Amino acid sequence: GFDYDVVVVGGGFAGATAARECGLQGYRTLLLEARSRLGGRTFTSRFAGQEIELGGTWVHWLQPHVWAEMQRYGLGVVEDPLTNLDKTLIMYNDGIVESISPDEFGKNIRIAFEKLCHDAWEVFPRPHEPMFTERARELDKSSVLDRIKTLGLSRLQQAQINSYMALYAGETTDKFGLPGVLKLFACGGWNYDAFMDTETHYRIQGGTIGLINAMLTDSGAEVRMSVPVTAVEQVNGGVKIKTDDDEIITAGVVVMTVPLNTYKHIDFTPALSKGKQRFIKEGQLSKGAKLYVHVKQNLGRVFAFADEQQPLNWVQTRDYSDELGTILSITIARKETIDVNDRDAVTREVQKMFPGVEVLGTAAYDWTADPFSLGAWAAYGVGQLSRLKDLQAAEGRIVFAGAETSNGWHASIDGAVESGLRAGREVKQLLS
Amino acid sequence: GFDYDVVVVGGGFAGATAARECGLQGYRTLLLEARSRLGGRTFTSRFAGQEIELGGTWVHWLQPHVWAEMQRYGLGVVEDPLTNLDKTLIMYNDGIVESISPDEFGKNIRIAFEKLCHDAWEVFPRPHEPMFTERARELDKSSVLDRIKTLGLSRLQQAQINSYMALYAGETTDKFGLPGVLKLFACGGWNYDAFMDTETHYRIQGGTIGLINAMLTDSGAEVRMSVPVTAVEQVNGGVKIKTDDDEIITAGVVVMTVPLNTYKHIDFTPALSKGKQRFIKEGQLSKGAKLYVHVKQNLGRVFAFADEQQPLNWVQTRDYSDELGTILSITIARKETIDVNDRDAVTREVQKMFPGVEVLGTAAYDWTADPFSLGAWAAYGVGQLSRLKDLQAAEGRIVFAGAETSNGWHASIDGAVESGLRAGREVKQLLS
Numbered sequence: 133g134f135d136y137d138v139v140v141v142g143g144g145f146a147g148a149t150a151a152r153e154c155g156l157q158g159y160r161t162l163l164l165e166a167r168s169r170l171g172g173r174t175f176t177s178r179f180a181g182q183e184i185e186l187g188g189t190w191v192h193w194l195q196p197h198v199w200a201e202m203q204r205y206g207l208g209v210v211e212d213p214l215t216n217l218d219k220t221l222i223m224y225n226d227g228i229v230e231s232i233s234p235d236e237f238g239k240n241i242r243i244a245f246e247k248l249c250h251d252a253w254e255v256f257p258r259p260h261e262p263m264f265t266e267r268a269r270e271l272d273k274s275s276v277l278d279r280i281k282t283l284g285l286s287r288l289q290q291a292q293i294n295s296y297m298a299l300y301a302g303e304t305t306d307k308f309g310l311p312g313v314l315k316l317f318a319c320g321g322w323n324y325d326a327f328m329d330t331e332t333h334y335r336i337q338g339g340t341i342g343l344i345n346a347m348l349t350d351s352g353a354e355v356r357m358s359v360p361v362t363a364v365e366q367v368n369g370g371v372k373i374k375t376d377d378d379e380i381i382t383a384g385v386v387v388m389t390v391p392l393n394t395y396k397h398i399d400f401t402p403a404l405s406k407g408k409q410r411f412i413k414e415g416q417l418s419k420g421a422k423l424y425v426h427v428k429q430n431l432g433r434v435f436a437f438a439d440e441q442q443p444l445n446w447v448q449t450r451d452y453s454d455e456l457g458t459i460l461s462i463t464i465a466r467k468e469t470i471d472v473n474d475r476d477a478v479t480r481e482v483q484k485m486f487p488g489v490e491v492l493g494t495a496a497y498d499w500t501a502d503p504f505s506l507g508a509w510a511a512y513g514v515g516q517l518s519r520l521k522d523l524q525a526a527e528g529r530i531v532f533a534g535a536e537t538s539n540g541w542h543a544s545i546d547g548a549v550e551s552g553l554r555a556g557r558e559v560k561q562l563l564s
Numbered sequence: 565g566f567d568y569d570v571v572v573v574g575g576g577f578a579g580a581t582a583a584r585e586c587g588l589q590g591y592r593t594l595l596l597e598a599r600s601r602l603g604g605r606t607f608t609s610r611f612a613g614q615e616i617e618l619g620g621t622w623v624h625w626l627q628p629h630v631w632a633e634m635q636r637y638g639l640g641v642v643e644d645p646l647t648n649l650d651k652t653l654i655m656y657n658d659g660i661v662e663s664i665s666p667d668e669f670g671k672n673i674r675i676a677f678e679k680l681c682h683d684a685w686e687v688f689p690r691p692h693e694p695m696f697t698e699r700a701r702e703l704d705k706s707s708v709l710d711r712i713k714t715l716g717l718s719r720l721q722q723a724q725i726n727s728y729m730a731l732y733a734g735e736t737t738d739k740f741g742l743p744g745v746l747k748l749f750a751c752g753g754w755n756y757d758a759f760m761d762t763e764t765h766y767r768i769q770g771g772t773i774g775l776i777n778a779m780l781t782d783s784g785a786e787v788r789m790s791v792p793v794t795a796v797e798q799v800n801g802g803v804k805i806k807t808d809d810d811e812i813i814t815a816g817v818v819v820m821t822v823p824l825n826t827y828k829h830i831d832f833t834p835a836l837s838k839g840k841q842r843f844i845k846e847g848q849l850s851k852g853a854k855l856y857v858h859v860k861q862n863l864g865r866v867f868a869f870a871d872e873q874q875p876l877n878w879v880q881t882r883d884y885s886d887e888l889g890t891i892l893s894i895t896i897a898r899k900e901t902i903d904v905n906d907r908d909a910v911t912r913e914v915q916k917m918f919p920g921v922e923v924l925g926t927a928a929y930d931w932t933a934d935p936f937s938l939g940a941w942a943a944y945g946v947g948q949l950s951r952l953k954d955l956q957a958a959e960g961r962i963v964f965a966g967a968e969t970s971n972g973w974h975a976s977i978d979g980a981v982e983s984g985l986r987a988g989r990e991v992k993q994l995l996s
């Protein structure tokens with residue numbers, strides 16, 4: 133006799149997926165979202181006359197959960213200009229920007245990545261069972277920098293791969309866990325060309341928010357925004373959920389999908405297991421941010437890495453023409469290197485990378501400062517992947533999901549969807 | 565005012581998927597299946613104390629649609645013994661059986677396959693859009709043998725790759741379309757090690773029939789077996805469906821999922837488009853069959869190719885031990901090379917490959933003789949992939965699906981599931 137069969141906390145991809153799974157079974161379903169918008173660590177917006185994605189953006193058909201959703205809802209891919217590049221740049225830690233022949237640039241990051249992931253087949257034959265091999269557990273004592281130091285890379289190759297890895301860490305690479313990277317590489321078919329294609333090439337037709345809305349419309353669930361959950365109590369065979377204004381909603385089961393780094397906002401009664409408490413105290417690593425810049429010049433199709441002591445770590449073209457100029461998509465590994473909301477600073481750093489351009493505008497999102505993400509994409513520190521099952525475990529009538537808790541594409545939209553399908557299955561089990 | 569909102573014809577993976585999609589929307593749904601069982605070109609059975617799969621068997625997490633279903637229903641993988649092989653054999657067209665070091669055997673098929681598919685990245689950058697490039701249309705004038713003749717392969721390599729390709733054709737390789745193979749290779753991450761892992765390594769926990777049953781239970785649809793549809797007439801804004809005993813069922817929309825090679829059993833009014841009629845007159849190529857053999861000896865973990873003039877084209881171990889002996893899974897490219905239901909012949913051919921073994925039993929399935937498949941897995945002849953859209957097109961209130969009609973993994977369970985998700989979306993569009 134509860135208010136709802138299931139309450140889903142969080143309206144990103146994990147929560148939207150879980151609510152869709154539950155609603156299609158006929159369960160009375162409520163989704164509670166803290167922000168005044170949906171999408172979570174994805175956010176569709178507009179800038180310089182284009183639709184832009186200020187969080188998670190790119191997907192691929194090798195990513196099984198999100199691709200199946202795109203198949204169900206009839207969403208095509210939209211290709212960003214990553215082939216036939218006009219310029220490929222590396223900006224080293226010492227501030228030098230060097231233009232590299234695009235063919236040579238791609239050959240060298242491929243060599244570095246395949247060397248970094250040389251044992252991916254042996255360590256992760258089953259990337260959706262991350263601790264399947266003893267070697268993966270042994271490697272979880274090492275960081276990505278530990279391995280980079282043994283590869284004998286050239287100066288170009290070392291700068292490229294350390295830029296790539298600092299971005300995926302949202303942190304310096306001495307803190308970044310090694311097995312999680314090998315596992316993503318295995319997910320992308322154990323080969324660099326395939327894996328790179330999955331990461332920044334194709335966007336969703338209609339945007340991330342379009343797929344969120346399709347799922348929630350399908351679900352039939354009641355959806356409420358601007359309602360943060362601040363406490364969850366298991367009592368009377370179900371759960372009592374309290375919001376910041378002390379209203380109480382009861383439910384048979386709760387699906388938690390909030391980002392790991394935000395669990396400090398929520399009091400659990402009884403306390404969560406010690407393993408989960410350890411993960412909550414640690415958090416995940418990433419301190420990233422994202423921004424678009426509109427410049428007056430037509431730079432064509434460009435790509436740049438910047439190493440971890442520099443701010444503009446991953447740059448590529450979103451749009452270009454003589455009439456428009458260029459819109460650049462820029463992802464930042466560590467928000468401490470640049471205040472993406474400080475336009476003067478942004479203009480200085482962009483000109484450092486592209487001397488002589490005039491900045492006509494910017495659009496930025498500081499995911500690390502946002503109270504309802506407190507960080508960016510999921511990134512495991514040393515030793516954390518080994519303990520993933522602690523985060524995944526159900527605790528009585530509370531089910532846990534979110535990209536951090538997925539087995540496969542944990543840094544991606546796909547991993548969020550995966551965790552939501554798992555959550556739907558677990559809700560069905562708990563309501564049987 | 566029809567009997568049903570939607571009638572799904574056929575209870576293989578495409579039909580089970582479509583019925584699930586439609587039932588979860590609340591549409592009044594009926595599935596009609598011709599055989600007295602479900603599963604279509606998959607069939608879970610029992611032999612020598614083990615559960616066996618006499619049709620489609622192996623899946624992979626790089627296959628997005630079937631993997632997402634396994635995530636939803638909580639189905640793990642079951643690994644067959646393909647690593648650390650004890651014996652790898654090649655049987656040439658001239659009947660010689662040669663034992664090859666397993667490491668060398670794998671190196672040589674990898675070289676042959678990567679050479680055959682050397683241009684897969686350029687021809688199929690988007691494997692789910694098969695005619696995206698002009699080069700793919702140009703290559704659809706050539707057969708797989710046409711390309712093999714230009715590779716300069718060794719005797720071992722040519723025999724290995726021609727065996728592999730005759731199996732995927734279910735026919736001799738001079739008739740097999742080239743682009744469809746390049747496209748499957750692209751689906752498997754554009755690399756041989758990944759692609760091979762997707763094809764014969766992992767089975768579905770609980771079997772193909774377990775996943776069919778889960779989908780149809782979820783669907784809530786009414787399911788009727790031993791009811792072949794023999795005619796479909798579009799009339800009165802919907803469809804009239806006639807069965808072999810002249811009963812008539814009416815519906816708003818019909819989803820056709822029967823195998824292409826069986827369309828001769830069904831009269832359409834009005835006639836289907838000329839493009840579809842051409843495909844129906846041509847059919848798809850494969851003439852394959854499958855069988856398991858129980859021998860008294862423990863052969864360990866074995867793998868064999870046999871070239872296309874010989875019958876046992878793809879052999880691997882299903883189970884082995886000293887107490888049990890060995891169960892071998894054998895797939896046959898062309899049913900004209902061996903009568904899989906003739907036990908004496910099977911014993912002769914197995915002994916030709918494994919001289920000295922004692923055959924204790926067999927279990928076989930002649931998919932090419934079965935009236936409700938009239939062939940095996942989908943295999944395109946020369947020029948057919950270019951015309952795929954003709955087969956996919958809706959015709960008024962009739963939607964078409966089945967693995968032959970998919971864009972990606974068309975030779976697989978995954979492509980069937982893909983086509984069923986597409987059909988569900990199209991039914992939703994037609995009922996709006």
Ligand SMILES: Cc1cc2c(cc1C)N(C[C@H](O)[C@H](O)[C@H](O)COP(=O)(O)OP(=O)(O)OC[C@H]1O[C@@H](n3cnc4c(N)ncnc43)[C@H](O)[C@@H]1O)c1[nH]c(=O)[nH]c(=O)c1N2
Nearest residue numbers: 142144145146166172173188189190361534535544545548
């Ligand atoms: C800048 C940037 C860039 C990328 C990416 C992320 C970021 C930040 N990613 C990763 C991808 O965006 C990410 O993995 C998923 O969006 C995570 O979805 P979840 O639903 O797990 O969490 P997510 O954080 O999206 O959703 C959780 C929800 O919980 C809410 N919430 C928090 N506390 C709450 C409370 N107390 N009460 C109620 N609700 C609460 C939040 O407001 C949020 O809506 C990505 N991926 C990819 O596939 N391709 C890409 O290109 C990128 N790039």
Ligand SMILES: Cc1cc2c(cc1C)N(C[C@H](O)[C@H](O)[C@H](O)COP(=O)(O)OP(=O)(O)OC[C@H]1O[C@@H](n3cnc4c(N)ncnc43)[C@H](O)[C@@H]1O)c1[nH]c(=O)[nH]c(=O)c1N2
Nearest residue numbers: 574576577578598604605620621622793966967976977980
């Ligand atoms: C021997 C063998 C081996 C393999 C495979 C196939 C075969 C035959 N495949 C391919 C895979 O099995 C195949 O692609 C799908 O099962 C096809 O699913 P569909 O639903 O498209 O057709 P499918 O043929 O399964 O379903 C069509 C249904 O329509 C019914 N029907 C026909 N005419 C009718 C009528 N007039 N009225 C009513 N119903 C009618 C049939 O009885 C059948 O149940 C495979 N794939 C893979 O992923 N891994 C693998 O290892 C293999 N290996």
Ligand SMILES: CN1CCC[C@H]1c1cccnc1
Nearest residue numbers: 190331332446463509543544
């Ligand atoms: C594809 N991604 C997953 C998480 C980070 C992200 C990414 C990669 C390159 C540039 N920006 C974001």
Ligand SMILES: CN1CCC[C@H]1c1cccnc1
Nearest residue numbers: 622763764878895941975976
């Ligand atoms: C994995 N497959 C798809 C269709 C044919 C099939 C196959 C491959 C190897 C041996 N038997 C069947």
